[PDB]
Fold this sequence. Notes:
- The complex is a heterotrimer.
- By secondary structure, chain B is mainly beta.
- Chain B folds into two domains: 1-112, Immunoglobulins (Immunoglobulin-like); 113-218, Immunoglobulin-like, CATH 2.60.40.
- In chain B, 5% of the residues lie in helices and 48% in strands.
- The longest helix of chain B is centred in the middle third of the chain and has 6 residues, at 127-132.
- The relative contact order of chain B is 0.16.
- Chain C has one helix spanning 3-11.
- Chain C is rod-shaped.
- One zinc ion is lined by residues 64, 86 of chain B.
- One zinc ion (ZN) sits between chains A (157, 159, 178) and B (142-143, 179).
Amino acid sequence: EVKLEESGGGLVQPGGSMKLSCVASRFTLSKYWMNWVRQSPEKGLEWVAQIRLKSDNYATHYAESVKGRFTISRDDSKSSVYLQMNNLRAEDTGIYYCTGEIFVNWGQGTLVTVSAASTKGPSVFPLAPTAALGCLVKDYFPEPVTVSWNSGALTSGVHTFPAVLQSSGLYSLSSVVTVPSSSLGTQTYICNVNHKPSNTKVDKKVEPK
Amino acid sequence: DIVMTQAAPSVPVTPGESVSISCRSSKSLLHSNGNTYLYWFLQRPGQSPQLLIYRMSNLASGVPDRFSGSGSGTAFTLRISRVEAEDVGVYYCMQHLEYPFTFGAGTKLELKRTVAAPSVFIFPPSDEQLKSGTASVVCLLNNFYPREAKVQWKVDNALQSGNSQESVTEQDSKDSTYSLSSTLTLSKADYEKHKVYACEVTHQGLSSPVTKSFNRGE
Amino acid sequence: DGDYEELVLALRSEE
Ligand SMILES: [Zn+2]
Ligand SMILES: [Zn+2]
Ligand SMILES: [Zn+2]
Ligand SMILES: [Zn+2]
Ligand SMILES: [Zn+2]
């Protein structure tokens, strides 16, 4: 029933600034200390900052890697807490979660990507042929991309793979599905791709060559 | 500067059997009470962490009673009596005795299952891609266990090295198997200088290494 | 409900 919801992440230049928000529903925020926690493949889960209550004079505590650059704050009347991130470093890339005092309630997390690289939308290529079909989603930045099949009706034999970073700095991803050989050239197969950072939306039928 | 050490990066478990996950702290987490300031979390794939245990041994509300936590000062153990598929994910410990709060690196729980050989497929570069200037050849290894698999790219039978990348799915919910994609990338110019493209797969389930190939023609 | 608040208050011990 309690819900925390963070927003504000995205792609930002090194040395730039960004402010994250976290809004609480069904939860009297003023009564609880609040924390930010971030996650990356590089360092796992890292506690970032904490803010206590009004009667604690809103006392704060910060991780060393972040002291002097991040400011956590709260506005109880807006049922929100914030993390102002300045002089952003590439090391600050990751998923940022807000959490309650005892770490039972977590938000869904918002993805912060610090890079000088510009956005680029991907190319989508077929993988045509029990048989296996796929779509290749090459050359995009930053993460994430979204792949579905038959507008979401085909969910069974689907395997969408983790993105791999290429030597070029661009990501690539394959999504593949297994279907019987007796539907090829009949039950049309279509992969639906979204790369929201580039506003790229592409549909692509997959048919036996 | 309290360091939290989770020795095992992963642990395999037969469904319905027990498992223990260990964590160590460089310093005692006993606060001047009977309180040990230690949390255990489970992060199921693609989800936020969720609390299993607080104060070292207390189950948080809604956590199944097959979880328990124990420990003495600097060494801690999370136990699952009978592992369900609900329980697959990454287990983290965390101390909040001192600022900065610190997490262990996580222990991933993997299900055991019977050996299962991969189904191997090969996909040539699409004509639409060839027009761009580069060729991506894709090899798929579908639904196999255990994760250990060797993919060998051969172009005109010459073993390939340095021009391919692999990506593995997470353990599948239904059948507990893995899947893997290996992509071979080449310029269109060098791709059209060769005929036979082969993907050779080695796996404990295979009697002998399996190869799926094609010629640029058909 | 007040269960959650009661739990958090019982665990808080800033001293
Ligand atoms: Zn206080
Ligand atoms: Zn359950
Ligand atoms: Zn599969
Ligand atoms: Zn060559
Ligand atoms: Zn105390």
